[PDB]
Amino acid sequence: GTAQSVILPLPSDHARFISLRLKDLSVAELKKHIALLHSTRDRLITQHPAAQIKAAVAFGPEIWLQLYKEMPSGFKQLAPQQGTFQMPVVPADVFIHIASARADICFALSQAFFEGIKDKVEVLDERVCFRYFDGRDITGFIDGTENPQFNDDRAEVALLPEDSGVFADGSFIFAQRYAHDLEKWKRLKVDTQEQIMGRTKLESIELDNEVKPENAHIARTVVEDENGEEMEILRHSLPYGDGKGDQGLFFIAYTKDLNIIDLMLNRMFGTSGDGIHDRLLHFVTPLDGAYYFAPSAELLEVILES
Amino acid sequence: GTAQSVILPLPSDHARFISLRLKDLSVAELKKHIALLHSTRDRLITQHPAAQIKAAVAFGPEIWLQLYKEMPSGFKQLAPQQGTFQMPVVPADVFIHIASARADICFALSQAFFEGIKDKVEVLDERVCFRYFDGRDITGFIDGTENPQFNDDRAEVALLPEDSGVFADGSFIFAQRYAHDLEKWKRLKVDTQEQIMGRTKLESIELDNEVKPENAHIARTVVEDENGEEMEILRHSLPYGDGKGDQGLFFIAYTKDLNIIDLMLNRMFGTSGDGIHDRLLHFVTPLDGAYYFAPSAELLEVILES
Amino acid sequence: GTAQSVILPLPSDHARFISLRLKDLSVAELKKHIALLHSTRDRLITQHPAAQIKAAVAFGPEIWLQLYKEMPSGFKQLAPQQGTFQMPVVPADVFIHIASARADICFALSQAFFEGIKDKVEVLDERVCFRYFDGRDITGFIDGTENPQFNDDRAEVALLPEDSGVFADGSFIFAQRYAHDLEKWKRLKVDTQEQIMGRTKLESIELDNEVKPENAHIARTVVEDENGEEMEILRHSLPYGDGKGDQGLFFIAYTKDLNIIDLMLNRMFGTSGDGIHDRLLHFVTPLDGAYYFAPSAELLEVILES
Ligand code: HEM
Numbered sequence: 005g006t007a008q009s010v011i012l013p014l015p016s017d018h019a020r021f022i023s024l025r026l027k028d029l030s031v032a033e034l035k036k037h038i039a040l041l042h043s044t045r046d047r048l049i050t051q052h053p054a055a056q057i058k059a060a061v062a063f064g065p066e067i068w069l070q071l072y073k074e075m076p077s078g079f080k081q082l083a084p085q086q087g088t089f090q091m092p093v094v095p096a097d098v099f100i101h102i103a104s105a106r107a108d109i110c111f112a113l114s115q116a117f118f119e120g121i122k123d124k125v126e127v128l129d130e131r132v133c134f135r136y137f138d139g140r141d142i143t144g145f146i147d148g149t150e151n152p153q154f155n156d157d158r159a160e161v162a163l164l165p166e167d168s169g170v171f172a173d174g175s176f177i178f179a180q181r182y183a184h185d186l187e188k189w190k191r192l193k194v195d196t197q198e199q200i201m202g203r204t205k206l207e208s209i210e211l212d213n214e215v216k217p218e219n220a221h222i223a224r225t226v227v228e229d230e231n232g233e234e235m236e237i238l239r240h241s242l243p244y245g246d247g248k249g250d251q252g253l254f255f256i257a258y259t260k261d262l263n264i265i266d267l268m269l270n271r272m273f274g275t276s277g278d279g280i281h282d283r284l285l286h287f288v289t290p291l292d293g294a295y296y297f298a299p300s301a302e303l304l305e306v307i308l309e310s
Numbered sequence: 311g312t313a314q315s316v317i318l319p320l321p322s323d324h325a326r327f328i329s330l331r332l333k334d335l336s337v338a339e340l341k342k343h344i345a346l347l348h349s350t351r352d353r354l355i356t357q358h359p360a361a362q363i364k365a366a367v368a369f370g371p372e373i374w375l376q377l378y379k380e381m382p383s384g385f386k387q388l389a390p391q392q393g394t395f396q397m398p399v400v401p402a403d404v405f406i407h408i409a410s411a412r413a414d415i416c417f418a419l420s421q422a423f424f425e426g427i428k429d430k431v432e433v434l435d436e437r438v439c440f441r442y443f444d445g446r447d448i449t450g451f452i453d454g455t456e457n458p459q460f461n462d463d464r465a466e467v468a469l470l471p472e473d474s475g476v477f478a479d480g481s482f483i484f485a486q487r488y489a490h491d492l493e494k495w496k497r498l499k500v501d502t503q504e505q506i507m508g509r510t511k512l513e514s515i516e517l518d519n520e521v522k523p524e525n526a527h528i529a530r531t532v533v534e535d536e537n538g539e540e541m542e543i544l545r546h547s548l549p550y551g552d553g554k555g556d557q558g559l560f561f562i563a564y565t566k567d568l569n570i571i572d573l574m575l576n577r578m579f580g581t582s583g584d585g586i587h588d589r590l591l592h593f594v595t596p597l598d599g600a601y602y603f604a605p606s607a608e609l610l611e612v613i614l615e616s
Numbered sequence: 617g618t619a620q621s622v623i624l625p626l627p628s629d630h631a632r633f634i635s636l637r638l639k640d641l642s643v644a645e646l647k648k649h650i651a652l653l654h655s656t657r658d659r660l661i662t663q664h665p666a667a668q669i670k671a672a673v674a675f676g677p678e679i680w681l682q683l684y685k686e687m688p689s690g691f692k693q694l695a696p697q698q699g700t701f702q703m704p705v706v707p708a709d710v711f712i713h714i715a716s717a718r719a720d721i722c723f724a725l726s727q728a729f730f731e732g733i734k735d736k737v738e739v740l741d742e743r744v745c746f747r748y749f750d751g752r753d754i755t756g757f758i759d760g761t762e763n764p765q766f767n768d769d770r771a772e773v774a775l776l777p778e779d780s781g782v783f784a785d786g787s788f789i790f791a792q793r794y795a796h797d798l799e800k801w802k803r804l805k806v807d808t809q810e811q812i813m814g815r816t817k818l819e820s821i822e823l824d825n826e827v828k829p830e831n832a833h834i835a836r837t838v839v840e841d842e843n844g845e846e847m848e849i850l851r852h853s854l855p856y857g858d859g860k861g862d863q864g865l866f867f868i869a870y871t872k873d874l875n876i877i878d879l880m881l882n883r884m885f886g887t888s889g890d891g892i893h894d895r896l897l898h899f900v901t902p903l904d905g906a907y908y909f910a911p912s913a914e915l916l917e918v919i920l921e922s
């Protein structure tokens with residue numbers, strides 16, 4: 005098997021994305037506080053069964069081996085990008101994806117995990133996110149058009165397969181917060197923004213092959229395998245922002261093969277070898293970034309009980 | 311496998327039903343514009359996952375062989391009724407069933423199909439339909455009481471089985487628009503209208519065998535095989551009308567065996583051999599009628615890619 | 617297989633719980649009126665598919681063998697308690713659990729069953745029940761926290777397994793109305809109420825083992841098999857009351873093994889052998905109580921058609 009509960013369902017209106025380092029927290033204390041998160045999750049589900057209360061807990065490469073003495077195949081840390089643009093890496097031990105139809109429930113789950121250990125861990129970010137109008141990024145463009153939509157497709161794209169042993173129905177998480185320069189963006193003509201993205205702004209209709217430039221965002225993030233077959237990821241990104249400061253997109257993807265995300269990042273930032281970079285990177289900036297492993301619910305339970 | 315998306319779910323509040331002949335449109339152009347419909351369908355699903363965006367595309371027996379080289383078993387055109395009342399047959403090459411919780415989305419899918427080809431095809435009808443109060447026909451009687459209701463029952467009744475090969479999860483459509491003579495109908499006592507339909511008006515309680523006439527509508531549309539077991543169809547009929555002109559029911563059924571609909575129509579129009587016809591035909595009039603085959607979503611995709 | 621429709625879904629906002637003895641009603645008449653209940657249920661489902669229209673019909677052990685040739689293994693009548701507190705048994709021939717999102721639908725189903733037989737049966741109770749604020753008992757404590765929640769868990773706990781043959785997907789019902797003494801309850805400090813229940817009042821957080829007393833309600837109702845595994849039941853209890861008179865909880869549980877309920881009641885009322893009783897029983901009084909068997913929907917259909 006069973007994916008953790010946030011991965012497969014369609015996105016809810018509210019989320020919290022948490023990345024942290026253990027600092028003074030022990031592995032046993034971490035298990036206790038994941039169990040505390042689960043306890044409050046379970047309790048509120050019984051009280052609010054329509055509130056779409058969902059979560060995933062995932063782990064960095066180093067702490068994972070402290071929980072389970074075997075790596076999933078291909079698990080590794082994200083590598084920085086030194087291309088036309090720079091992409092940073094900020095390693096984190098624990099990632100928590102909380103989501104619900106309600107902002108107060110998203111907070112309740114975070115509160116439950118952190119109760120009594122606020123000063124024992126080092127939280128890199130606890131990002132509050134929200135659906136933004138009709139599923140748009142704050143550029144005004146719809147985000148998610150080519151994301152897998154059917155349940156079975158979402159599972160096939162995101163989840164490790166049955167012959168991964170205990171790692172089956174786990175998933176690799178790539179999480180990276182972007183901050184937008186909307187003032188620079190808003191000076192562009194709409195036609196130009198559509199050239200940068202590769203889809204139309206109002207409708208998200210894909211631009212024709214003649215009209216879409218090679219450096220458009222979705223030209224760079226569409227990737228094929230050796231046989232020329234398209235390779236996909238399951239995105240769960242959500243906007244965030246404050247009027248006073250950063251505003252942008254919290255990018256997150258679930259995948260059964262981090263090599264797919266490596267390739268897209270190479271092509272966006274300009275390290276793929278073909279001399280091209282994503283023109284959208286002239287208007288948005290990544291501020292963190294890491295890779296994690298989200299076990300299945302059954303494997304997570306084994307870890308908590310060990 | 312997969313039935314086309316409109317067949318199995320319970321009916322939505324809004325629909326459009328389209329019958330057309332290719333006229334000047336080429337088979338290649340037809341595949342292009344189905345794909346355009348599918349493209350707008352898919353895009354709007356992503357943006358409105360709760361809007362119940364559904365459709366089926368189906369083909370007449372004459373054009374099907376130009377799209378696929380094998381004929382599903384039992385596929386033939388609707389035959390005329392030389393009965394007490396006459397039933398017209400108006401062949402069409404393409405039938406399109408569009409449904410949604412929202413009227414604007416129904417329009418958007420039709421607009422997507424027709425963009426740039428309005429004068430190349432011969433549209434027989436594009437009927438806007440709506441759920442009418444608590445699922446009633448404009449006679450005031452509830453329509454659907456004995457329709458299969460469970461998902462499994464609906465699939466069993468409407469869909470070709472696994473042994474049909476490529477044709478599995480396809481379905482045959484019978485579509486026929488009716489105009490009602492409400493002036494005549496409303497001159498009846500309610501007790502008489504209940505005699506004519508075979509259920510009570512307010513509640514749709516079935517009349518007892520002692521009270522139900524042999525020429526009541528549901529006495530004629532209940533049919534059984536050689537072993538006395540009832541044969542069923544999956545109706546998706548919906549009211550339509552304008553105050554200024556025609557008002558009625560757009561009748562449509564999905565079935566895995568067109569012979570069942572042949573038998574019901576024979577009993578209705580008075581050619582089954584017992585000399586009885588449906589008294590309801592004194593108050594409603596068929597204005598067209600045809601049979602079609604709706605492939606599975608997989609087979610349709612193969613047709614589109616071919 | 618198919619459990620009767622009310623068992624597995626999460627609870628709706630309104631219910632009616634009916635217990636009766638046949639008195640002058642014949643077995644044939646009983647089947648007729650169960651069929652009338654089913655007919656009205658089916659008809660209303662078609663008109664209100666979102667109104668959560670559900671029911672279970674179940675039978676006492678005394679009448680079951682008049683309806684079917686074989687007893688499900690272990691079926692028996694409730695036994696009385698003579699412990700710290702007394703528990704009479706009030707046997708009944710037929711139990712009906714009616715539920716819906718709407719009170720009028722609940723009445724409609726009861727009306728349909730009873731039409732024309734009100735003076736033929738001996739109705740012991742027809743209790744109108746309602747969800748009380750956020751799923752609470754009128755004590756103010758949330759009721760349901762440790763109930764099975766996932767559909768598959770609820771099925772495993774409540775339903776007879778496949779090796780029960782024709783009884784597979786049947787369920788045993790224990791139904792028992794309680795009246796509360798709220799004036800006595802409300803004189804307690806909340807911390808004492810939490811001692812009595814074993815969970816916190818506002819949040820239903822379980823009390824730590826060191827603070828939960830041995831005679832707390834959930835200390836008595838948490839029961840363990842010989843191999844150390846906790847034995848569960850599926851509760852569907854709902855509050856009832858009138859300002860002028862009795863107010864309380866209509867307790868009802870579905871289980872695959874009545875021996876589980878036996879042990880729970882023994883521990884609560886003080887006859888289990890450890891000399892302890894449930895302190896909650898100082899504030900609530902049982903007013904009836906009996907065991908029933910709810911067949912699968914298919915087995916129920918066999919009984920109706922025989
Ligand atoms: C602030 C940063 C970003 C913004 C505003 C953004 C926005 C968008 C938009 C508007 C689309 C088209 C609609 C859609 O199909 O979802 C899209 C597509 C996509 N983006 Fe991004 N994106 C960002 C960063 C990223 C990153 C870091 C990746 C990781 C490699 C990524 C991967 C993808 C993918 C895989 C698609 C689907 C393309 C396809 O298959 O057609 N995006 N994005």
Ligand code: HEM
Pocket residue numbers: 447449451452453454455456457486488507509514527528531532543559561571574575594595
């Ligand atoms: C103006 C045209 C029609 C009207 C107003 C109409 C109306 C109704 C009504 C009020 C019912 C009873 C409620 C229900 O069980 O759905 C019904 C049932 C039914 N109708 Fe029609 N109908 C029309 C045409 C047709 C046609 C052309 C067919 C088939 C060729 C058909 C097939 C059926 C069937 C199979 C049932 C279910 C009967 C049963 O199994 O009990 N109807 N219709």
Ligand code: HEM
Pocket residue numbers: 753755757758759760761762763794813815820833834837838849864865867877880881900
């Ligand atoms: C007026 C009478 C009763 C009241 C007010 C009451 C109230 C409660 C409350 C507040 C809880 C804790 C929340 C929960 O887990 O659902 C609970 C749990 C429970 N009750 Fe009762 N109850 C009553 C009678 C009974 C009876 C008669 C039985 C069985 C013979 C029973 C069996 C259980 C069980 C099995 C649990 C779950 C315990 C666990 O596994 O943690 N209850 N009840």
